[PDB]
């Protein structure tokens with residue numbers, strides 16, 4: 001079993017000429033150490049969802065697409081506590097008509113919690129949390145509201161390891 005709720009924060013700076021290129025990719029890694037992990041544990045990379053980010057009074061809408069660098073489960077041997085994970089994110093323009101999941105208000109930067117999450121929990125805990133999360137998004141709720149419930153469900157009796165992303169775009 002593992003039990004800790006761990007997170008890392010990364011920054012994504014959108015290029016000043018994104019209006020031309022209209023695509024950008026970033027890649028992040030992080031080594032987590034959960035000192036509570038005992039026995040053998042399987043850490044599952046949770047399938048991510050695209051995020052629609054709204055900037056400057058939601059006049060600039062961006063689509064963030066996330067892909068795990070290693071899509072395989074992480075296997076921790078007996079009392080092994082540390083593991084490396086990461087993901088790549090691709091930034092593209094969202095349709096003019098897209099619903100914003102995360103809004104910067106009047107500014108050009110947003111903090112996005114839980115863009116990518118791994119869990120040590122069972123398939124039952126993971127699937128319930130993941131499904132409620134996606135239904136929450138489909139029901140039109142904000143990313144932060146949904147992700148907080150999602151991380152909270154995963155963190156109850158298991159380890160949850162989250163990537164947070166700050167996105168900024170200042171052309």
Ligand SMILES: [Mg+2]
Nearest residue numbers: 006032033034
């Ligand atoms: Mg730590």
